[PDB]
Amino acid sequence: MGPGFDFAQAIMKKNTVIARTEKGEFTMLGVYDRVAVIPTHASVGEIIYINDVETRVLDACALRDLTDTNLEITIVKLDRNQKFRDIRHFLPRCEDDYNDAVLSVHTSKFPNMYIPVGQVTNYGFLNLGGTPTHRILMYNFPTRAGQCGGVVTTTGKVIGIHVGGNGAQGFAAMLLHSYFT
Numbered sequence: 001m002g003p004g005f006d007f008a009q010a011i012m013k014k015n016t017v018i019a020r021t022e023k024g025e026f027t028m029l030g031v032y033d034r035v036a037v038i039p040t041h042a043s044v045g046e047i048i049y050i051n052d053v054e055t056r057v058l059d060a061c062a063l064r065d066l067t068d069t070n071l072e073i074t075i076v077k078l079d080r081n082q083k084f085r086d087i088r089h090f091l092p093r094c095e096d097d098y099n100d101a102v103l104s105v106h107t108s109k110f111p112n113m114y115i116p117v118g119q120v121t122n123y124g125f126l127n128l129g130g131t132p133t134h135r136i137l138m139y140n141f142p143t144r145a146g147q148c149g150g151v152v153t154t155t156g157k158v159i160g161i162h163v164g165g166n167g168a169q170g171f172a173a174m175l176l177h178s179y180f181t
Contacts, residue, residue: 005114008102008153012114014085016106016151020049025107026149028076029161030084031091031180034058039148039163039173040074041129048076055079063179069134072163072173075180090158091177097122098154101139103162103170105150113150117141117170120152120159126171128164135174136163143170 011029019028021042028050030036038044044060056079063071098120105113117139126136137152143165150162152172160172 003155004100004102004116004153007155008104008114008151011087011090011151011153011158012104012106012112015087017050018052018107019149020052021045024148025109025146027105027107027151027161028149029151029158029175032086032088033083034078034080035180036076036078036084037161037175038074038076039161040070040072041163042074042149044074044076048078050078050080065134067134070128070131071135072128072131072133073161073175073179087158088177088180090156091175091180092157092159093177095122095135095174095176096159098137098157098159100154101159102153103139103141103143103147103150103172104153105147105162107146109146115141115143117152120172123171128171133163133173135176137172137174139170139172140168141170142168
C-alpha cells in the first residue's frame with residue numbers, strides 16, 4: 001500500500017523460500033550465494049525441504065554471542081543449484097531501535113502475508129521458551145504460531161527474523177552485517 005510494503009514485497013519475492021524441518025514450516029530468508037537464515041528452534045538437520053525439494057545442508061551454525069548466550073539465528077548453507085540475490089548491503093551494522101517496521105511471512109498456511117507492526121524496540125535480553133537469548137527486537141503486535149522466520153524490514157533495511165511472541169508482543173532476532181562477512 002506504501003513504501004514500507006514495497007520494500008518488504010521486493011525482499012519476499014526474490015529472497016525467501018519455504019523451509020520444512022521435523023519441527024514445522026518456516027519462512028527462510030536467503031542472504032547471499034546459497035546462505036540463508038532460520039530460527040535455531042527449527043532444529044535444522046543434514047536434510048531440509050526447500051519449496052518441497054529435498055535439499056542437503058552443506059553447513060549449519062547456531063549463532064551465540066561472545067557471552068556464549070543464544071542469539072536464536074541459525075545460518076544454513078544449502079546444496080541448491082541457484083544463488084540468492086545478495087542483500088547484505090540492506091543489513092544494519094549495529095544494534096538499534098526502528099520506526100514503522102513490516103513483518104512479512106510466506107508459508108503454505110500464510111501466503112503473501114504482510115503485517116505493519118510499527119515501532120521496534122531494542123529489547124536485548126529475553127527468556128525465550130526457557131532459553132536466555134540476547135539481541136531481541138520487540139514490537140506490539142499479537143503474532144501467532146506460523147509467523148516464525150518471518151522477515152522484519154523497514155524502508156531500506158532488513159533488520160531481523162521473527163522468533164516468538166507472548167500473545168500481545170512479538171520478538172525478532174537481530175540480523176547484523178557482521179554475521180555474513
